[PDB]
Amino acid sequence: PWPASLAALALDGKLRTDSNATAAASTDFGNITSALPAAVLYPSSTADLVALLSAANSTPGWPYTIAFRGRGHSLMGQAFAPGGVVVNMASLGDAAAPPRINVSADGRYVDAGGEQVWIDVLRASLARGVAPRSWTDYLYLTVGGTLSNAGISGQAFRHGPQISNVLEMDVITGHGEMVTCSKQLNADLFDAVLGGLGQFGVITRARIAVEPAPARARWVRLVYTDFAAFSADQERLTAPRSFGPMSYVEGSVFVNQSLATDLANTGFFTDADVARIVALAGERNATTVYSIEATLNYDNATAAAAAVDQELASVLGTLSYVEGFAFQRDVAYAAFLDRVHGEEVALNKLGLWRVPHPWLNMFVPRSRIADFDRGVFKGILQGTDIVGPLIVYPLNKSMWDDGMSAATPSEDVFYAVSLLFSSVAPNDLARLQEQNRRILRFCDLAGIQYKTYAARHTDRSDWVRHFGAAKWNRFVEMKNKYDPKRLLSPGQDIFN
Ligand SMILES: *Cc1cc2c(cc1C)nc1c(=O)[nH]c(=O)nc-1n2C[C@H](O)[C@H](O)[C@H](O)COP(=O)(O)OP(=O)(O)OC[C@H]1O[C@@H](n2cnc3c(N)ncnc32)[C@H](O)[C@@H]1O
Numbered sequence: 001p002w003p004a005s006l007a008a009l010a011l012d013g014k015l016r017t018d019s020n021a022t023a024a025a026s027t028d029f030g031n032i033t034s035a036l037p038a039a040v041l042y043p044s045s046t047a048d049l050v051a052l053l054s055a056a057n058s059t060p061g062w063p064y065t066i067a068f069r070g071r072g073h074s075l076m077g078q079a080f081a082p083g084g085v086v087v088n089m090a091s092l093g094d095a096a097a098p099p100r101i102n103v104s105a106d107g108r109y110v111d112a113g114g115e116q117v118w119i120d121v122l123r124a125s126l127a128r129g130v131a132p133r134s135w136t137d138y139l140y141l142t143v144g145g146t147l148s149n150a151g152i153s154g155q156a157f158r159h160g161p162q163i164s165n166v167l168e169m170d171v172i173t174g175h176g177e178m179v180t181c182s183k184q185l186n187a188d189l190f191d192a193v194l195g196g197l198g199q200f201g202v203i204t205r206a207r208i209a210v211e212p213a214p215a216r217a218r219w220v221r222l223v224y225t226d227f228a229a230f231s232a233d234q235e236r237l238t239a240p241r242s243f244g245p246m247s248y249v250e251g252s253v254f255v256n257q258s259l260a261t262d263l264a265n266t267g268f269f270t271d272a273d274v275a276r277i278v279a280l281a282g283e284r285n286a287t288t289v290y291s292i293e294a295t296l297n298y299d300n301a302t303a304a305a306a307a308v309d310q311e312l313a314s315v316l317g318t319l320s321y322v323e324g325f326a327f328q329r330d331v332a333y334a335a336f337l338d339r340v341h342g343e344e345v346a347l348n349k350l351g352l353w354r355v356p357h358p359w360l361n362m363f364v365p366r367s368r369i370a371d372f373d374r375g376v377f378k379g380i381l382q383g384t385d386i387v388g389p390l391i392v393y394p395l396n397k398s399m400w401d402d403g404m405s406a407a408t409p410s411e412d413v414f415y416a417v418s419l420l421f422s423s424v425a426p427n428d429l430a431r432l433q434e435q436n437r438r439i440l441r442f443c444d445l446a447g448i449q450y451k452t453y454a455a456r457h458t459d460r461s462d463w464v465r466h467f468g469a470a471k472w473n474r475f476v477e478m479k480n481k482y483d484p485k486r487l488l489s490p491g492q493d494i495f496n
Pocket residue numbers: 029067068069070071072073074075078079089114115135136137138141142143144145146148149150151152153197198199201202203204454489491492
């Protein structure tokens with residue numbers, strides 16, 4: 001027997017089973033794994049979400065797991081619902097009204113539907129002279145999707161990840177109950193969902209903190225051949241003083257074998273800059289080159305430009321990058337934030353976007369980053385042609401709420417390490433997948449206590465180690481409270 005509200009979804013054509021629908025919801029950005037769902041739900045309102053979830057909760061024996069597809073940027077099927085129901089979240093935003101993104105009247109925050117993509121949140125915020133303070137490097141991800149992970153970029157060191165910049169949320173638990181939560185109301189759900197990997201319920205609305213939107217960003221890259229100086233400077237730039245003037249701090253690693261190509265692919269360096277850096281590398285006989293990428297946000301004020309030069313000159317004076325290897329660009333704030341979009345378009349038309357992405361994303365404690373550099377950047381990755389950026393930058397644990405579901409290393413400072421390998425060559429995927437296992441194995445043997453990010457584990461012991469025994473028990477307690485039937489986001493392979 002089908003509940004009335006559930007059948008209604010079928011009648012209205014919102015609950016589809018056609019091969020076209022199931023196929024679209026069976027693959028993701030990873031392009032590595034696939035799983036066809038039994039049906040796809042195209043909700044037009046959050047009421048449709050309650051119907052499905054309420055049905056599953058009241059219907060004994062309900063065999064359909066449910067996933068919430070944001071934009072499917074998951075790497076290993078975390079958004080799939082094998083033989084179940086995949087909710088096409090984007091459908092919640094088809095209606096030209098009511099709006100799915102509303103900047104508060106006081107301009108202190110912006111309400112965004114969970115299905116909304118950050119690029120749109122940005123545009124709707126800029127319209128009101130404000131903007132979220134913590135981003136992701138790529139803006140075509142959903143609010144609910146990044147919040148179910150953490151949401152990190154070069155601003156997280158001072159504003160924390162996106163999950164640390166949410167005032168409250170509307171969540172529909174695995175029981176089918178609509179619940180508004182925050183640090184004051186239903187905090188137990190609020191904390192569980194943030195970094196919760198879609199295990200406790202679906203986020204239909206997230207209240208995102210905003211700050212006055214800067215007009216431009218002074219964009220700089222500093223080059224190093226010495227990892228010690230590179231990491232020391234990234235830490236100096238992101239160390240609590242209150243923080244330094246930098247609005248964003250990230251870093252890149254360039255292996256010597258493909259130095260010129262990767263430097264050119266940054267879209268930042270000119271061929272003249274590339275030549276200088278390649279020469280520098282040879283002079284120092286470096287097998288790896290490092291680049292700090294940082295920005296200084298600022299407004300159109302008449303003195304802004306001059307003030308920026310002085311602030312930047314001052315900050316750079318505290319650093320140790322190779323003399324004369326500071327490279328500057330100055331762009332509109334939005335242009336910087338959406339800087340990766342241009343890369344996607346190019347790669348896609350070139351047929352290099354819709355390919356396997358055996359990406360390795362992890363958090364490495366500061367005390368072992370130098371060891372990671374030696375074993376990975378100067379070790380495992382040496383002797384290979386790298387297509388895709390190798391991103392490395394420090395984060396401050398103080399800006400992360402351990403009470404939430406997201407797991408992080410125990411040290412005060414840890415690095416986000418993102419090796420965005422693209423299986424561009426024919427069937428080069430197997431090598432890359434093996435390489436990532438080798439990197440993780442290297443870390444396990446060196447005793448490096450890392451945390452993976454946006455990655456799913458297929459073994460319970462791994463998820464327990466990921467969260468930590470105590471934090472795991474907490475995760476289970478919340479799972480038993482918000483999704484006892486273990487139906488939500490089975491693709492994470494935590495309870496499925
Ligand atoms: C493809 C990609 C991803 C990416 C990135 C660049 C690219 C090209 N750059 C990132 C960055 O700089 N920083 C960062 O923190 N993440 C970055 N990502 C990774 C991205 O955060 C994850 O892919 C994330 O999953 C969000 O992507 P998306 O919005 O597309 O979500 P999904 O893949 O479809 O789903 C992820 C899991 O979350 C659950 N889910 C999704 N929406 C909801 C809601 N609204 N409520 C509760 N759960 C939700 C799914 O069920 C799934 O388990």
